DNA sequence: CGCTCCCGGAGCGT
DNA sequence: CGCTCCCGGAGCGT
């Protein structure tokens, strides 16, 4: 097999970038910055399978990809990850008095990783003939540093430099300026854990605010640079409706609840890989403002287009 | 049985408060404000049995309660919660291809509630014959309302007012001034979810800051009211070291890692219910300043004393 | 029904 | 090893 790089020693992206990330998800070759995905092959193939048929039915790839992105939850629910993992990991509890198992650990991790893998793969495909607007899992080295706050912490005589790298699960960014970027935080479910996305959104704002940085003893490399860095959330909202005594989803309902709304309110945008929901917008316009606390995931192609001035 | 109140209709706490809290947890009588705890009996008895033995051994009761507080993780690990719940709840996966069971859900909820239940019970004991310094689960009605931010969120011609009630798992407060209080957030495990505590810590800071309030368009009843409200965190850090391929604890180690430090650095104090950890301080003086990022939980006796000017 | 609980290693990054 | 992933109802409060 072969193994390549995505970035050089100065942090610059190599040429033909997107095809390298897509080839990595395809298990075509290795990469310095990413391990092969452990359990991505089945669900990736089904994504392709679903979208090779659609575009064969005449439909333009752009539309097929918008629709697919907005249906990733169906895709994830259709993949029996449990059965695939069972042949490898112990289904019995890690501890004598515990409830988690290696299998449930693997399941939890992999379904989360596959959610991100999926929309990294999708964006890679829709951008595979563009070398101006790149997409990668995690953050490109320049944006990671830029999005890293520093907090000097003195306790008595002890001094501790605390490093605070603001979270991004994946990123689409400008080659000529990696700060010109859409930073995406993803979670397969919201619940109160959505709150985690919210401190990062809070830190993202703070990195731009000189008063706030001074208040908390925070330092940034540059607040100006981050002006073009947008911070969004994407979710699959996967609560299986057919659960015994299921209490329902956090987005697929008539209107999102109060404390769900607030987490969404501190992000620039929030997406759900679902399509039939009333309060969820299917239309996105950066210029005339946020249409709704929630957008269909397919709308991310629209802000990619509107921000970086391209067509897909 | 008999059923009583913790707060009068105006919000003021009834006399002889703290033994109404202890009796509720003893399931001597009912309360308006709290359901009786679902499965606290077994571990509550072990707590009592443990300190009566330590006291009978000749140890001063203050020293005994402090020691128990700093060993609550041992108590929780010694209670076979899973066995007690296996009679009632079903171990099969909630969903065909899922990984969670109604039993596991019960385990997770109840082990979290018991951790809080424990140190509420402990503090109610420690404060048995004090009616100026009170302890309750959750927040007293006036501190609760005082810690509730609001956010006007206009999208387009919609408008929704967003409530943001800053979290407290349990609270120790002055009868004469409920905003003279220690608010405590608790978690059995840290991991990355400690991050949730951190946004709430940020919100509690924000509620005292006019610039920050205005920045994110937030309203509070009174910033100056919260000047004596302190915001701390307590953790049991229960990662069982006997789990196969265990990665160990977040505070029981030579040095808390960077991002665990970060979360801790945004709280006034962080406690662990473990003793004998090198970096974890066993001394607490408000006057001379935070001794370290982490304290033994028994040191909460010490800040209660210093802050409210009482002897326990 | 709103909101919160999480007896934790797998997996990936450095 | 640092940090993050979580096919979600039970339980408590209202
Ligand atoms: Ca994420
Ligand atoms: Ca009295
Ligand atoms: Ca009795
Ligand atoms: Ca808590």
Numbering used by the authors:
A (entry chain B), B (entry chain A): 1 to 312
Provide the authors' original text about this structure:
PfoI belongs to the CCGG-family and cleaves the 7 bp sequence 5′-T|CCNGGA ("|" designates cleavage position). Structures and mutagenesis indicate that PfoI features a permuted E…ExD…K active site that differs from the consensus motif characteristic to other family members.
After numerous trials to crystallize PfoI with oligoduplexes of various lengths containing 3′- or 5′-T overhangs or blunt ends, diffracting crystals of the PfoI–DNA complex were obtained using 14 bp oligoduplex SP14 containing the C:C mismatch at the central base pair and 3′-T overhang. They contain both polypeptide chains of the PfoI dimer, and non-cleaved, specifically bound double-stranded DNA in the asymmetric unit. Altogether four Ca2+ ions are found in the structure, two in the active sites of the protomers, and two additional ones on the surface of one of the protomers. One of the water molecules that coordinate the Ca2+ is in a position just slightly too distant for in-line attack on the scissile phosphate, showing that the Ca2+ occupies the canonical metal A-binding site (54–56). This water molecule should also be coordinated by active site lysine K187, which is absent in the structure due to K187A mutation. In the complex with cognate DNA, the N-subdomain of PfoI undergoes significant structural change due to the intersubunit swapping of loops (residues 78–111) that in the apo-form do not contribute to the dimer interface. While the central nucleotide is also flipped, DNA is not compressed, like in EcoRII-C, PspGI and Ecl18kI, but the DNA strand carrying GG step is bent toward the major groove starting from the flipped base.
